[PDB]
């Protein structure tokens, strides 16, 4: 790959510079290069990988939603025919988004997940796998939509099982996994009751464990707990 000639440490350094510069495509390319060196990632490095690709796919997802809404309106009664352009451009953005998701899933499969033994790494990567299958599911409409959804569910479920056995209820990775799996239930799997139940149980079990934490850990956990609460308020 184009990062093959750059030192691992230099790729990490440049990923951090790219973040400061809000150059998220560069950040993601540097982190992909770092992963492709073949060594496991540290906690900080995993976080950089996640931030870089989330910012990239987030721009694509926002654009896709804008274009899909225009396309949906164009297909309403009384809307004037304007040609193939809206569909074409929505498809262009869609294909690019799918390519980014496939790239992330490919890094996870070759070979981050299989070498991840500690709960903090394995849950993190399995959550990411769920997230990027979820983004694929958001745009899927063909014979494989059900399989894409089930791939997201399967990754999230394995992550959930490990997190419940190996992490405290306030662990931020555990909390963020639960938050995102709950969003999956609500928005992808047509299971709002499961989404609400998961968010509630997660929030309550975290509340009960806050007393064990330092001030800094408390701040980290309560931040994500507030996101759970925000979704519960939206959904109920």
């Amino acid at each position: 790959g184009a990062m093959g000639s750059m030192e691992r440490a230099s790729l990490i350094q440049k990923a951090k510079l790219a973040e400061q510069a809000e150059r998220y495509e560069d950040m993601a390319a540097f982190m992909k290069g770092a992963v492709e060196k073949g060594e496991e990632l540290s906690c900080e490095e995993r976080n950089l990988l996640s931030v870089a690709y989330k910012n990239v796919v987030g721009g694509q997802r926002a654009a896709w939603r804008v274009l899909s809404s225009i396309e949906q309106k164009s297909n309403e009664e009384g809307s004037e025919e304007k040609g193939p352009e809206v569909r074409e451009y929505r498809e262009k953005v869609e294909t690019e988004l799918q390519g980014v998701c496939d790239t992330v899933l490919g890094l996870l499969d070759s070979h981050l997940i299989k070498e991840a033994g500690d709960a903090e790494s394995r849950v993190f990567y399995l959550k990411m796998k769920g997230d990027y299958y979820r983004y694929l599911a958001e745009v899927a409409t063909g014979d494989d939509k059900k399989r894409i959804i089930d791939s997201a569910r399967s990754a999230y479920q394995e992550a959930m099982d490990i997190s419940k056995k190996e992490m405290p209820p306030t662990n931020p990775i555990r909390l963020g996994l639960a938050l995102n799996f709950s969003v999956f239930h609500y928005e992808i799997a047509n299971s709002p009751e499961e989404a609400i139940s998961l968010a509630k149980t997660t929030f309550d079990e975290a509340m009960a464990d806050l007393h064990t934490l330092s001030e800094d850990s408390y701040k980290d956990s309560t931040l994500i707990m507030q996101l759970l609460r925000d979704n519960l308020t939206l959904w109920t």
């Binding site: 969003v183 928005e187 939206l234």
Partner: peptide, 9 residues
């Protein structure tokens, strides 16, 4: 619509 984590910056 719903909040997930990480989010966009």
């Amino acid at each position: 619509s719903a909040g997930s984590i990480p989010g966009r910056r």
